[PDB]
Structure 1
Amino acid sequence: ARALDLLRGLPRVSLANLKPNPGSKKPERRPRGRRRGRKCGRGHKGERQRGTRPRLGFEGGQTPFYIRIPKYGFNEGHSFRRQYKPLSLNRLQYLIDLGRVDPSQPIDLTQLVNGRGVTIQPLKRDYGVQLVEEGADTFTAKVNIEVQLASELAIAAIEKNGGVVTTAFYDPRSLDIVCKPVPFFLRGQPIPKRMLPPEELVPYYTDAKNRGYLADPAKFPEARLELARKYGYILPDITKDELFKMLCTRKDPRQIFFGLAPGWVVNMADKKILKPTDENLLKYYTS
């Protein structure tokens, strides 16, 4: 290009030819001059010139505006209201198309964190990821998806495409461990066991409508047929396909990692795993 053609000439670019972008380094404005003096941009007599005004929000003494308004339980239990990062079907399709988050394996939270599709944070009262019914149309993935929340519309949209929707619950510590398993393994501790949800999520996860891991497995086809009759589209028999055993994995409870089991100790250096012997330890972990 012309850049190198022009650089061919002129002397070498030493440390004496450096110059910041014109318009970035704003010149300093010090109070030492005729225009910037006398009063030093402070005003006439008073606290303004003396720099000793009242606190913020003060209005001379009257009831400030931020006090005249009564109280209300707006952000009362805001420090405990569960929150989940939205996950759009269009986002999932884009991820599958760009390569990351391959549909050949279960769409666990670890896979999504690795592909970096919905960057969540263990902190900030976050206990998993929710689902959104944005990309209802033009969606064709066919893969077992695992999301905490899910609606009937998107559930059916995913099922008719040959998928398997499921829901789980990740405890705070379990969610933090699933978010960043590398530092967890590097810390040097055994894989804990995720506890059960509270009384508020027990009835939500113990139902076949939202596809829960604590409901009767025989009610799944009933809800599937119900959603099909509601939104049409004949149910494609997943039993007569190629990837059946792969999608049959449901991830038993008290199992944080889809592959590993609680109690085992992973070691980065020297790729090996220790067995949690001792009858007491096994009884306390997995009975």
Structure 2
Amino acid sequence: RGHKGERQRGTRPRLGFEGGQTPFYIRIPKYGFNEGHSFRRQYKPLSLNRLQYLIDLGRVDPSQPIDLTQLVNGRGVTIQPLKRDYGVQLVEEGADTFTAKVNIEVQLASELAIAAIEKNGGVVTTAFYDPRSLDIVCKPVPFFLRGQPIPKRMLPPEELVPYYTDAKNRGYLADPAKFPEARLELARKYGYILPDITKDELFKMLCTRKDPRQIFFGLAPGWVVNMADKKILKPTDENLLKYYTS
């Protein structure tokens, strides 16, 4: 422990104290590096490399729509809603070697990632999730054990509304009339011939899109999932039905 002084006595000043000189961590001006950090939205990246790897190893089935639930179940991505994760962002990394036809739903998508997905004959849509809906989507089984009716998926905040109503982002709230134009624009820009997915034998699968207020593909808001006896209780009260449809 040394010899005498505060250090042998065990009473040396706090960490960061500099003997009275204005400490380094206080003499530096305050700057908004981390202002609002806990309210910034975070999106876990999903590179096309990782997506192709998952598809190749069979952990993600491209024959069915790929949403956040399927990604998590295949363990392709780890979402932490409590840490302000708002979902998954597609990432162009691996685009030049992506060769999978997939119907994938994500929260953000880069232009190049959209281009790769569409060139392979697939469909990509950016879908928003509030923190609660995101938690339920990422871990549905715990939610089903909570014994609560499936809630409605909330709409994007005002700042995010334009993003999800824009067709260039394949927003899930965007006018579907503008989608062919945007897809043709990407095909022209990136020099590939747009494949007419309507002719594909999986066109129905590629078209399936959950309703903007729907969390799970085949389950409607307000239903209760009784896993114990493999049943789905549906409300019939007019007020409840109106609420869960609104």
Q: TM-score range by the shorter chain?
A: over 0.9
Question: Which protein is bigger by CA-based radius of gyration?
Answer: 1
Of 89-98 and 118-127, deviating more is: 118-127
Residues matched between the structures, number: 246
C-alpha displacement of 1:60: 1.2
Deviations 1:133-175 (A, max 9, x none): 1001121110111111111111111101100010101111100
Question: Could you list the per-position Cα deviations for residues 26-70 of structure 1 after superposition, in whole angstroms to 9, with x for gaps in the alignment?
Answer: xxxxxxxxxxxxxxxx11121111111111111111111111111
1:282 to partner: Cα distance: 0.7
| 1:119 CA displacement | 1.3
Other structure's SS at 1:137 match: helix
Residue 184, structure 1, aligned to residue 140, structure 2: no
Match of 1:172 among 131, 144, 156: 131
Q: Paired residue for 2:50, among 91, 109, 114?
A: 91
CA RMSD across the alignment = 0.9
- SS of corresponding position for 1:130: strand
CA–CA distance in 2 between the matches of 1:273 and 1:60?
68
1:90-134 deviation digits (Å, cap 9, x = unpaired): 101110111111101001111111100111112101111111110
Gap runs ≥5 in structure 2? none
Moved over 6 A (4+): none
Superposition pairs of residues 135-174 of structure 1, within 5 angstroms: 135-174=94-133
Q: What CA distance in whole angstroms lies between the structure 2 residues aligned with 1:284 and 1:216?
A: 25
Stretches of structure 1 lacking an aligned partner (at least 5 in a row): 1-41
Select the structure that is richer in strand.
Answer: 2
- Taking structure 1 as the reference length, what is the TM-score of the superposition? 0.84
| Counterpart position of 1:207 | 166
Alpha-carbon shift at residue 277 of structure 1 (Å):
1.0
Q: Secondary structure at the match of 1:191?
A: coil
SS of the aligned residue for 1:79 comes to helix
> 1 or 2, which has the higher helix percentage?
2
SS in 1 for 2:72: helix
In 1, the alpha carbon distance for the partners of 2:55 and 2:171 equals 25
In 1, the alpha carbon distance for the partners of 2:206 and 2:98 equals 19
Question: How many Å separate the matches in 2 of 1:243 and 1:175?
Answer: 27
- How far off is 1:85 after superposition? 0.8
Q: Distance in 2 between matches of 1:103 and 1:198?
A: 31
Distance 1:80 1:239 in 2: 41
1:239 matched to 2:198: yes
